[PDB]
Amino acid sequence: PEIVGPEKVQSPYPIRFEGKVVHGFGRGSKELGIPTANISEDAIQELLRYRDSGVYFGYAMVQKRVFPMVMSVSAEVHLIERQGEDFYEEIMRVIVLGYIRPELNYAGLDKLIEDIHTDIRVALNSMDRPSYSSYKKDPFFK
């Protein structure tokens, strides 16, 4: 599907949390134009308590700037941006707005990378709606 999630953001969404980025933003995903941050197990256990594993979407803030994102749930955040920004800080705020799909069986490196680009396209489409886009200015990102 080209789009996912109901018209409005409602329970279980949104899910707000702040966590530390462990192991920095790797050069590999950076070379692919997908800044990636792995969130520390702590700070997400309670906020993600009853959520199924898989790929989620929403917004994330780093270095005082907000970007749309997709996150694999452990939590791996892939920021969506096309300018090759310099990400290095260790604290990130994330707001999960909806679910995209469950995890898929591993089928190689390129398939993994292509699924991420697809998830990103779908996330962008899914957040085009007013109930979703307003969270870019959420007080949590103050």
Swiss-Prot record:
Tagged with keyword Chloroplast: no
Pathway: Cofactor biosynthesis; FMN biosynthesis; FMN from riboflavin (ATP route): step 1/1
Superkingdom of this protein's organism: Eukaryota
Any GO MF annotation of the entry: ATP binding
Cofactor comment: Binds 1 zinc ion per subunit.
InterPro entries, A to Z: Riboflavin_kinase, Riboflavin_kinase_bac/euk, Riboflavin_kinase_dom_sf
EC annotation from Swiss-Prot or TrEMBL: 2.7.1.26
Binding-site positions, Zn(2+): 36
Pfam families: Flavokinase
Class in the EC hierarchy, top level: transferase
Quaternary structure and partners: Monomer.
Name of protein: Riboflavin kinase
Organism of provenance: Schizosaccharomyces pombe (strain 972 / ATCC 24843) (Fission yeast)
